[PDB]
Symmetry: D2
Subunit: 433 residues, 4 copies
């Protein structure tokens, strides 16, 4: 709670309090959220028993995809592999080498960003060729993979949008096939994190069963003991939890920002907790509060990132001249001392709601394994929102400690800064073996 004492307007305070109560979250809501989530999950496993290749989104809005990984690696091997990444704010290319134990090194010097797949994969090939001058692959999108070497996607989430031409944009073909034209073992981000938290940590912490990505997207993978009952091969399941529907709270700003998107009526849970939309949400709140006291630029979309929000949050300067530069170079508004308070309040409330819902999702995944009471297990958390934002990591663990009260010290959160980059390489540790 900020609760700044500087004398502010007696009317603007009401417009602040209204929009703050709009974003308020209470534990009576999270306690229903958890049960909604676990019900959805078991229903999705049931549904996967019936039709192992249909989705049928009017039951289990999660498309609980299968990851053919059948062996959580032990971390005892060697090898040097080249790997490609894609999906985040910019793709990467890693030239990694492994150690006989947890340690692992990488070069990974790499760069990235009416447009078809030809020019895109031409850029892919040219970049990997440039980097080649001194195996696996990662695609961070919803893919339906028959086996390890083969993977085909369904659509184009995250706000990304490939051009619409006769050249048949990427959505609708196997990726390993289209890759070889430019030039193994394709995986996703969450499974990559879950793997990378096995080779890395060891001998002191309980094993890891949950992999969470909080960043440009929001996704999760987890380990399931009953993978033999529900017929599909693979110890860990990829939830596409960015598609939760049931009763999540929605302020009108959310409805407006959803009416103005390509993936309309889908990916509703992702649009509240992911880094791609938090800046837009904050900007749209900061207009119904200033009320024509704003500038001409504050009405222009995509003019406030989540990175600037992370700066406004981590504001411990004696005066607030740190965020003043952000406000000035983003909106050309020389804010007084009465409006920066509103800005800080709004950023705090928005990111607080995001952290609370993410913690609720993590706890609801945890309660499903039911091993929390018997023993302990760890969850590896990755993403730009989590590790690159200190104010986030404390609110998240607070909201998590409050939810699963009694059994709190059985789910250890492990930040995994290595990213899915190392996971793409460690993918070889099972296929090669």
């Amino acid at each position: 709670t900020i609760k700044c004492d500087i004398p502010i307007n007696e009317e603007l305070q009401a417009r602040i309090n209204k929009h703050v109560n709009q974003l308020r979250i209470t534990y009576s809501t999270l306690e229903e959220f958890v049960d909604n989530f676990v019900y959805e999950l078991k229903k999705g496993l049931e549904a996967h028993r019936r039709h192992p290749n249909l989705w049928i989104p009017h039951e289990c809005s999660f498309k609980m995809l299968d990851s053919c990984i059948a062996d959580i690696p032990t971390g005892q091997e060697k090898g040097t592999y080249y790997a490609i990444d894609f999906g985040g704010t910019n793709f990467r290319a890693v030239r990694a080498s492994l150690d006989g134990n947890g340690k692992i090194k990488r070069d990974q010097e790499t760069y990235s960003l009416h447009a078809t797949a030809s020019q895109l994969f031409d850029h892919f090939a040219e970049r990997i060729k440039y980097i080649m001058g001194e195996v696996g692959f990662t695609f961070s999108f919803p893919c339906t993979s028959p086996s390890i070497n083969c993977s085909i996607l369904i659509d184009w989430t995250k706000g990304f949008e490939t051009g619409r031409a006769t050249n048949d944009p990427v959505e609708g073909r196997d990726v390993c096939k289209l890759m070889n034209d430019a030039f193994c073992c394709v995986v996703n981000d969450a499974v990559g994190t879950l793997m990378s938290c096995a080779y890395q940590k060891g001998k002191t912490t309980p094993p890891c069963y949950i992999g969470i990505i909080l960043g440009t997207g929001s996704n999760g993978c987890y380990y399931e003991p009953e993978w033999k009952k529900y017929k599909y091969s693979g110890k860990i399941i990829n939830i596409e939890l960015g598609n939760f529907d049931k009763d999540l709270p929605l302020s009108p700003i959310d409805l407006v920002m959803d009416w103005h998107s390509a993936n309309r009526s889908r990916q509703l849970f992702e649009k509240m907790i992911s880094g791609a939309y938090l800046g837009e949400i904050v900007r749209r709140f900061m207009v119904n509060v200033l009320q024509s006291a704003s500038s001409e630029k504050m009405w222009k979309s995509d003019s406030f990132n989540s990175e600037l929000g992370s700066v406004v949050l981590n504001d411990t300067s004696p005066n607030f001249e740190e965020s003043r530069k952000v406000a000035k170079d983003a909106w050309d508004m020389d804010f007084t001392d009465e409006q920066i308070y509103a800005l800080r309040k709004i950023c705090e409330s928005v990111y607080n709601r995001s952290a609370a819902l993410a913690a609720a999702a993590i706890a609801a995944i945890a309660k499903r394994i039911k091993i929390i009471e018997h023993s302990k297990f760890s969850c590896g958390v990755d993403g730009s929102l989590f590790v690159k934002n200190a104010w986030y990591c404390k609110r998240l663990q607070e909201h998590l400690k409050v939810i699963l009260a009694d059994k709190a010290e059985n789910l250890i959160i492990i930040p995994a800064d290595d990213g899915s980059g190392k996971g793409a390489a460690i993918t070889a540790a099972v296929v090669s073996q």
Copy 2:
């Protein structure tokens, strides 16, 4: 089309065109609207055969209520009756006398407007007593009437809201019972219009089968030949067509204005074509277009009626100084010559959409009787939007002529300015007989 030639900003024109295309309506949409409406109607008759006292809104969002009227009056009688009205912007009280033919006269000098039914009906009784110093009743709300003398409502639409106290606000009791405490034959507005268009007109125009109210609300009644097949007594059915759902087009302004209402998720078709919300819609458009060029008052809700919109529409003054007074005394904004164009454009587009949807509803009701090809019949139109606004009556008949092209000169529109006031009295013409 306005298409004013005065040089305006080259950017503001884009913000105008975007919001204009947002409200655009095309005949490819109306041609599906009509079929949607007729399907809904027949489905509702089917549903009424099964359960004649349940609603079940997940089939036929129309609650096709029964009106016990079993005789379209002939118009040959006499008598002086007192009657009460209620439902519009203000209730009335009429002391009418009838003639041996179409003519009819009335005194109807009357006045009107955490609040319970005791004080409300106390005001009712005191007003009718005051007027008494030289039968029927009208309640313009959704009522489930077992017979003529008895009527009980279900909820409180139109934006009206009776106070919430232990005194059990009006929603949930028979009206004729609660009336006698203050002090016959209760009807609604649409059936009142349909009756009042029988006594009034005669000997030159085909009989009337449709009654439409377009004003603070939007409602319809119609005559059905198959009233014997579908089991309920009464020649005419009251559609509560303010509850259409299927695929009506919604701009984000509509979603925002619906999130801020008491009757949320219900009465969705009424919120686009009724006079109670047009001013609010125009005000909410006139902020995303001026973009901080607005005043402090333009952000205050309920500060622009539909009456002022009717003035801005009927603007034939040499200069636009007629609407300038409206803008000034409503928002304290001395508009230049570049913004009044935007105001006129927005009002035109909004009221145009309203008129188009109303005409679509009328034509879809007409196509259901199927007697349009064989013979001709008339529809009596009433309401503050229709008769008290000259720009509306021409756009409405244009959009109606375009829809039912070939058989246009078989549905004659009759403006009935007498209102349901006379209909309340003529109700006695069947019960007394």
Copy 3:
């Protein structure tokens, strides 16, 4: 488990086992049933806050009606009242007198059973007049009561069906009004039981908060502390739990028996646990098992009651010649010793499923008050299925003990044979006071 050892056919055993597994119930299902029920309940309270007179069955298939009772009686009074009952297999008429404590006596000598309400209430009046020759009322149907003295119903459940004539069958009018034409304080069956379990028991058992009716119907009422939060007056709420929908298990016999009913697509939970349909379900199972070994009469509907099922269950005769008379005088089939085993097995399985689901409903209502852990409270059970069938009362308490394991000895089941008859009279104990 019967598990009879007499040598039977090796094929007929397979046809028995298939239909037995069709009706199998497991605790993994009940553990989801309870959570479904509690979720539905809280959702219904939420919904009642919004619209206190609409139903909207696509949220909360329970129509959680209000009972204006605001005082659980203490049981210290006197008085002699006449009361009328209706709803079960036959209506009653009671002339009861009260005692200064728990004791209460009654005369209640009474009789009962294209047909309109005129002749029905004529029979009512003639019977009550005949009995008059040496206050309250009970209507066992879904009624929407504004206050105590006034009550209007919605439809006609239980299989009852009033004739369809112009005389406007009973569905759609206030009952207290239509009663006076023949000749207070109308209540329902569940609230009647809940009241009658307060005057009767005392000083040794914890107070009662749940009233359950299991018979021709299946209904429940319960006490809610938060009746002030959710806006309606009355300490106890009448759940119409015969309308549960979510995921109840359905064998094809259920679909066929539901396609052949008047209240189609509604009252789905009642059709599996109520006494009006158990005989029909058993008869329809006993044809797909005997497979043309049946008689001509076994294909005739309504030829096997639940009373005969209670006789077949309570079969402790040395030989099975007790149920042989039932089979003979019901189907004219002189069953051998190989088919009576099938009959007993089928009756056992059906009534077992019924008892299990009823116990699940009771436990799910109990878990909602949340007072089970702190203190203890009792539930009063009434109905023809419960008290008039000894085999039922043991299976029910077994299935209840298994569900709420740890806190079992905090919910005491009290059989209330007095019926709602005494409750109708005790209704006066609050209105008179």
Copy 4:
């Protein structure tokens, strides 16, 4: 209408009339069916504009798949090709040669039928090798084809069921890939018929725009002018019309037969008009009519084909001793002269409903092109039900003539006995060109 005059039982006649009225179809239903179908179709095109690789079955239960065919062949070429078929009651293998005009010849000597794809495609390879000893492919299942050479399916309809083992049954992989392991240009049945009706017919009949398959399955393809507007490449669209949902009539036999199937809750329109289920439906009707007068074998599933129904229909023998052999060798029931009448009546009614619904589907597809009024076009009909059953082809054209009355002589029905076998070969006429 049969209306046999032989004196039959006066009670059995009632049991016949009840089940006959259960299957009755009236034109007031078909007139709504057509509009339902056309609405669904346009909605599906709209939906395909948005997401060209998702299905989302809660809008447009048709998965209006794309067929990359961009040139209706002209029929002027030569060539000898080998082709494979699959999907019907048994797969085929054709060695066809073409002529410089409509004529075409083929050898096509071929045979066919806990089981994985390895052994299945081993049988495929061994059979094609055996036949090789003196290009295209056809897969009659729902497949999502990115291009011509590549095709991947989604699930396993028609009642077919590949074994469930770790070997990953066929559902979920590209077919052209898995084919080469055993050993072009994969198409479906409806598009095959539509192609084969272009090379074959010419110079006298208007061009063909509709391809219908009525047999073990029921499917349709059609030509669309607006294929440029809705973004996908290909002049003709494959409707998977076996998945219609909206309001098709269902007798309880349908619900029971649907509860006992693998593809439960899906493929609901196919289960009423396709040849795979008509025999089962007739058998299940012929038990509730004979009522224990049946045999032990009449209660055994899959004991009556549609081929025997075609024999019972085409019964013009002086006595009915032709169908008597069918009844005897199928059920071991020496039917009297009073039961064969019931059998004929039931078969007639069932196949009549099937033909009526198929004609409704054809007419509803026709009304969508809207070219019926301006010019004429032909539809090529194929399948075991149509050409191999003379009683079907007359009822179908009757029901079609009644539906589209005025414009009847603009849609010419062309029986195409050649099958999709020739279409698989003619597929080369566009890819080779």
